[PDB]
C-alpha cells in the first residue's frame, strides 16, 4: 500500500510518500541524482571507477606479509592507514542515529529515546504486502525449516582462523555490556543506556548497583577469597540482583555487574579477571596518589579499564578476527584532524549479526574433562576446582567453531538460534541484499553466489524462491567464507563499521579526555597504551599463563 514498500531509492537515498500511490527520493548528498538516486554525478563516476571491492582490499590485507611488516614498522605509514580504516568505516554509520523498530522515518522520539536499539535500515512498513516489502511470497519460510536445513550442525566445523575459547568467551563477555535486550518491551529495546563500552558489565548499569558492588575503600570493588584466590563477592554480602537457578547455594551466588554472568563459568572467568584488574589499578593509582580518596580512585580506575578494553579489542580481538597482516592501532589522536562524532547508538543489526551461535563447541574441554552443556552451564564449582589458571590454559587450546559456511549451529542451542531468525522478522528487517547495498556491497544474484556451493543454495531457493528476499541473519551463517576465514563478506562489512564506531565513539577517545591527567597521570595512561590480552591475563592470573585468541 505504501509507495515506499519496494525500497525504490538507491545509494542511501531516502523514500518519502507524496500521495497514496507515488514516492519521491531525497538524493541529498548521496553522490547520485534522478528519480531513484541511480544517476551518478561526475565525481561519483570517477570514485566508483577507482574504488576497489571489499574482497579485493581484504586480499591485500591478508597477503604480502613481508610488505606489511615494513609498513607496520614505519609509524607515520601505520598511522595513515589506521586513520583511513577508522574514517572510511565510520562514514557508513548514521551518527546522530536515525531509525528504530517503530520509526521508518526520522523523528524526535527515535532520536531521543535511548531504550531503543537504533536501526541502520528502517523497518518494512506494516501495510506492505510482503514481509520484505513487495518481493517474495506472502509469508517468509518456516524458520524451523531454515534452521534445520542449512544452519544446524552435523559435524563440528572448527574455525580455520584458529579462534579459541578464550576468544569465544571474550566476545560473549565484552558484547554483553551493550547487547542487553529488554524483552519486557521487545527485541528492539535495550537496557544498556550507555550504548557502548562503559563496562557496566563490571560496575553495574545503575548507581545503586555500582555502590553495592564497591568496597568504598581505595576505590576497589568488593571481593571474597576462595582457596587463597580473589573472586567476586556474594549476593548475600552485596544484596546485588543476580540471575541464578534455584539450586545454586548462597556460597556460589557471585555478584557481578551483569546479572547473567554467573550462569556460564566462561563469563565468570572474565568477570573475575576484570575485577582483579580493577583492584590492581587501584593499588597502582594509590601508590601514585596517596592523597586521593576512594571515589577518585574508583572513577579513575574505571576510565583506565575502559581504555584497556578498547585497546585490547582493537589490537588483539579485532586484530585476530580481521586476519590482516597490518598491525591495527588504538590511537585516538588519529581522528583529531578528521570529522568524527564522539557518540554511539547501538544498532539492532549489530546485535543480530553478533549472534555467533556456531562459535560454540560441542563440549567445553578443561584439563582432560569434556563437559557437556548440561554439565558446564550454571556450574561455577568447575571453575573453582580447576582454577582460573587452568581455565585460561585449556580455553587457549580449545578450538572454536566457524561462524560462516553453514551447518555449524550446535543442536543444543537450536531454540535460541531459531529465535534470532524470528526476532529479525518481528522487527521487520529488510532483506540481506538491502543491507548489502546499504553497506556498499553488491547484491547477491543467486543463492549459489551467496553460499559458494550447490546443496545449501538449492535448499534456500526452495524455501525463499527469490534471492532478494533472503534474510540477513541466516545468510550471515551460510555465507561463503573468505578463504580459510571465520566470516563471509557481509559479516565483516557490516560488523566492522558498527564495531569501530562503538570503540572510537567513546568519550575517552575525544581530545578533551585523551590526555594523561584523565587517567591519573603518565603511569595510568601507560596502563592503557600497553594493555593486551596477554598482559591482562599475566597480571591477574596466577602463574601468568600464555594466552591469545588463536590456538597454537
Amino acid at each position, epitope marked *: 500500500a505504501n509507495p515506499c514498500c519496494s525500497n525504490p531509492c538507491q545509494n542511501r537515498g531516502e523514500c518519502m510518500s507524496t500521495g497514496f500511490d507515488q514516492y519521491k527520493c531525497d538524493c541529498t548528498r548521496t553522490g547520485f541524482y534522478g528519480e531513484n538516486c541511480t544517476t551518478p554525478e561526475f565525481l561519483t563516476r570517477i570514485k566508483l571507477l577507482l574504488k576497489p571491492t571489499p574482497n579485493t582490499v581484504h586480499y591485500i590485507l591478508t597477503h604480502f606479509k613481508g610488505v606489511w611488516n615494513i609498513v607496520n614498522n614505519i609509524p607515520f605509514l601505520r598511522s595513515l592507514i589506521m586513520k583511513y580504516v577508522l574514517t572510511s568505516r565510520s562514514y557508513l554509520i548514521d551518527s546522530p542515529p536515525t531509525y528504530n523498530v517503530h520509526y521508518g522515518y526520522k523523528s524526535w522520539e527515535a532520536f531521543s529515546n535511548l531504550s531503543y536499539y537504533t536501526r541502520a535500515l528502517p523497518p518494512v512498513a506494516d501495510d506492505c504486502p510482503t514481509p520484505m516489502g513487495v518481493k517474495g511470497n506472502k509469508e517468509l519460510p518456516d524458520s524451523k525449516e531454515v534452521l534445520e536445513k542449512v544452519l544446524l550442525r552435523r559435524e563440528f566445523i572448527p574455525d580455520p582462523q584458529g579462534s579459541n575459547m578464550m576468544f569465544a568467551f571474550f566476545a560473549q563477555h565484552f558484547t554483553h555490556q551493550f547487547f542487553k535486550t529488554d524483552h519486557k518491551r*521487545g527485541p*528492539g529495546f535495550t537496557r544498556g543506556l550507555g550504548h557502548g563500552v562503559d563496562l557496566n558489565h563490571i560496575y553495574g548499569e545503575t548507581l545503586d548497583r555500582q555502590h553495592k558492588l564497591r568496597l568504598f575503600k581505595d576505590g576497589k570493588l568488593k571481593y571474597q577469597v576462595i582457596g587463597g584466590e580473589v573472586y567476586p563477592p556474594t549476593v548475600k554480602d552485596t544484596q546485588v540482583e543476580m*540471575i541464578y537457578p534455584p539450586h545454586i547455594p548462597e556460597n556460589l551466588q557471585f555478584a557481578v555487574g551483569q546479572e547473567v554472568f554467573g550462569l556460564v563459568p566462561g563469563l565468570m572467568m572474565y568477570a573475575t579477571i576484570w575485577l582483579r584488574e580493577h583492584n590492581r589499578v587501584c593499588d597502582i593509582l594509590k601508590q601514585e596518589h596517596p592523597e586521593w580518596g576512594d571515589e577518585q580512585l574508583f572513577q579513575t580506575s574505571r576510565l583506565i579499564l575502559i581504555g584497556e578494553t578498547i585497546k585490547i579489542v582493537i589490537e588483539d580481538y579485532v586484530q585476530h578476527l580481521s586476519g590482516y597482516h597490518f598491525k591495527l592501532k588504538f590511537d585516538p589522536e588519529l581522528l583529531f584532524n578528521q570529522q568524527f562524532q564522539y557518540q554511539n547508538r547501538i544498532a539492532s543489526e549489530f546485535n543480530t549479526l553478533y549472534h555467533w551461535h556456531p562459535l560454540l563447541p560441542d563440549t567445553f574441554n578443561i584439563e582432560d574433562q569434556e563437559y557437556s552443556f548440561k554439565q558446564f552451564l550454571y556450574n561455577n564449582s568447575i571453575l573453582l576446582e580447576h582454577g582460573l589458571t587452568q581455565f585460561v590454559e585449556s580455553f587457549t587450546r580449545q578450538i572454536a567453531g566457524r561462524v560462516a559456511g553453514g551447518r555449524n549451529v550446535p543442536i543444543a542451542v537450536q531454540a535460541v538460534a531459531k529465535a534470532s531468525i524470528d526476532q529479525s522478522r518481528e522487527m521487520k528487517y529488510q532483506s540481506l541484499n538491502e543491507y548489502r547495498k546499504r553497506f556498499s556491497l553488491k547484491p547477491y544474484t543467486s543463492f549459489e553466489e551467496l553460499t559458494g556451493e550447490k546443496e545449501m543454495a538449492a535448499e534456500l531457493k526452495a524455501l525463499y524462491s527469490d534471492i532478494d528476499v533472503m534474510e540477513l541473519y541466516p545468510a550471515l551463517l551460510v555465507e561463503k567464507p573468505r578463504p580459510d576465514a571465520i566470516f563471509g563478506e557481509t559479516m565483516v562489512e557490516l560488523g566492522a563499521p558498527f564495531s569501530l564506531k562503538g570503540l572510537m565513539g567513546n568519550p575517552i577517545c575525544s581530545p578533551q579526555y585523551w590526555k594523561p591527567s584523565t587517567f591519573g597521570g603518565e603511569v595510568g595512561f601507560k596502563i592503557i597504551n600497553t594493555a593486551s590480552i596477554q598482559s591482562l591475563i599475566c597480571n591477574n592470573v596466577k602463574g601468568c599463563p600464555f594466552t591469545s585468541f588463536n590456538v597454537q
Partner: nanobody
Amino acid sequence: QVQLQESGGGLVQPGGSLRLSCAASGSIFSIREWGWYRQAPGKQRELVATITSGGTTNYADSVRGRFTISRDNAKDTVYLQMNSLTPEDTAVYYCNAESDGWYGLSYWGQGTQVTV
C-alpha cells in the same frame, strides 16, 4: 529470576470457557518467550501456546483457533483464553518462560487444574 503463578483453572462442562492467567515477576527483561503447557493424567507434557517478547504466537494443532495466548506487558501477565472446552482438554496447565541466550534459564509455574 522470574516467578510464575497460574490461576483461573477450575471445573467446567463441555463447551464452556475459561481464561487462565499467569502472573510473572522478577527478571522480566530476560524472557524472550512465554508459553502455556498442559499435562493430562498419565500422558506427556505437551505444548499448548507460546508467544515471544516480539509477539510471535504459535499454537498446537489441537488447540489452534479456540485457544488464544496474549501478554499484558503493563501487568506482566500472560493470558490463555480457552473456549469450546472439550473433555480432552482436561489437564494441569503450566505457565512457562524462556530466557534469552543459549545459557538462559527455563522457568515453570505451579500449574492450575482444568477439569472439563
